[PDB]
Design a protein around this ligand. Structure first.
Ligand SMILES: c1ccc(Cn2c(-c3ccccc3)nc3ccccc32)cc1
Ligand SMILES: c1ccc(Cn2c(-c3ccccc3)nc3ccccc32)cc1
Length: 146
């Protein structure tokens, strides 16, 4: 498949270099330099339990891409014991080939949050990276609230 080949070339040229998450306040709650978008392994992350109390979280994601993309975007779902509680869609748009870019996003809370003690180790955030219609990769991060 031609679309399969193109998806693989974009994955091959892509890297998430670093990311922060902030109370939308301004305070950095989490930051890391591990590429959490790599597919096929379950990533793990520890975040402060107080993040669950934010009405919104601001994310800064810095990424490199050898390939040009027409409409880079993400679909992300929070799963609790296998069940999707919440979904978000974000669009970055055009990506210049061989560029490194910082993408800021406002992630808004939906519903009432279970306690951190119940959620911890039982939440997966699944992130699907698209160029327009073309699915480039699916990755998963298991969350611990600490
Ligand atoms: C720590 C940072 C990010 C996540 C999940 N995640 C999020 C995210 C975090 C919280 C709510 C919504 C999405 N955006 C991502 C972009 C690329 C890769 C992973 C992403 C889990 C733990
Ligand atoms: C504000 C916006 C988004 C969130 C997303 N979120 C998060 C989360 C938020 C920020 C970083 C890591 C996880 N864990 C959740 C568990 C169940 C439902 C939603 C969850 C929290 C606060």
């Amino acid at each position: 498949s031609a679309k399969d080949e193109r998806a693989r070339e974009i994955l091959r040229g892509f890297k998430l270099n670093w990311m922060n998450l902030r109370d939308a306040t301004g305070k950095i709650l989490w930051q890391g330099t591990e590429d959490l978008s790599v597919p096929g392994v379950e990533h793990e992350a520890r975040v402060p339990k107080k993040i669950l109390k934010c009405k919104a979280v601001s994310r800064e994601l810095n990424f490199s891409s050898t390939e040009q993309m027409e409409k880079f975007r993400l679909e992300q779902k929070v799963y609790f014991k296998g069940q999707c509680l919440e979904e978000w869609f974000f669009e970055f748009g055009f990506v210049i080939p061989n560029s490194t870019n910082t993408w800021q996003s406002l992630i808004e809370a939906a519903s009432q949050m279970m306690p951190a003690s119940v959620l911890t180790g039982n939440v997966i955030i699944e992130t699907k990276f698209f160029d327009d219609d073309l699915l480039v990769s699916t990755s998963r991060v298991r969350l611990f609230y600490v």
